[PDB]
Symmetry: C2
Subunit: 165 residues, 2 copies
């Protein structure tokens, strides 16, 4: 119970179902959090009171057809990231193994980014990471939500010291 | 740049630093999110406008002295959790290896919990559930936040089909 109920969903249909359950129970302030801009745009059109943007950390994505190679490189990334005190968030989306690193300064996210490149070609997979270009993309997608008529938008980050830059 | 800025921190000092940076940049609505109740209580005393409770999924914690045994138990938990489509969040805090599992229904959180118990025996470490599946404890900690003077509280979950009992 609380003043604001936040639905965290990576599936757009499951997001709608939980918003309907909370709205039918009388919840006045339902928020929807997702790293998927389409889920946030769908929550705006279907009943979301607040839209929460996930703009924290750095996401490393290993891609490959051999699952015993994506995990092999992900485990070494986890072991080294935990040794720096980072928080690691993993999900497997098709052939994409997404790894989000939070809780470490920008100097350590680059160390892990350079190790991810070394782990990619060492196991024959591909690596991609997020950068400053995603910040510009974030402000643009936020303005697309404002122009679609979003009244309350929240932006979440683990490090507002670098994000202000 | 949005109406609400949310500080997600697991370190109390880093939380205070980022709230101070945003307040001096003119942010009118600063929120603080943490799975640590003390960080939420410290953000309330700092002047946080919104406290976000993490009430989603299930948190299992491996404890032990051999780090390459907390890891290997965590690695096997990741392998099976990914086979269910789950999102896995890990952090290493002292001798505690915290594993949070979201995006899966109640029957899968139970099965992974029983596998964590089976993996703790195979590697000689201890596993406990340090979060999730205890709505009364969550509600009581929320009521401690109101009585300390929290005027805006947010509760976050990936599974309101089960958490609707809190309402
Ligand atoms: Ca959140």
């Amino acid at each position: 119970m609380g003043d604001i109920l936040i639905v965290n969903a990576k599936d757009v249909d499951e997001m709608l179902k939980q918003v309907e359950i909370l709205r039918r129970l009388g919840a006045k302030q339902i928020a929807v959090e997702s790293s998927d801009w389409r889920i946030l745009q769908e929550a705006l059109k279907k009943g979301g009171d607040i839209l929460i943007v996930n703009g924290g950390g750095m996401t490393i994505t290993f891609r490959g057809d051999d699952l015993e190679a994506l995990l092999k490189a992900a485990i070494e990334m986890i072991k080294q990231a935990l040794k720096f005190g980072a928080t690691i968030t993993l999900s497997l989306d098709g052939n994409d193994l997404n790894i989000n690193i939070t809780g470490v300064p920008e100097q350590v996210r680059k160390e892990l980014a350079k190790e991810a490149e070394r782990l990619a070609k060492e196991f024959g997979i591909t690596v991609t990471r997020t950068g400053g270009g995603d910040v510009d993309e974030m402000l643009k997608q936020v303005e697309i939500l404002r122009r679609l008529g979003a009244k309350q938008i929240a932006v979440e980050s683990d490090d507002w010291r670098i994000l202000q830059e």
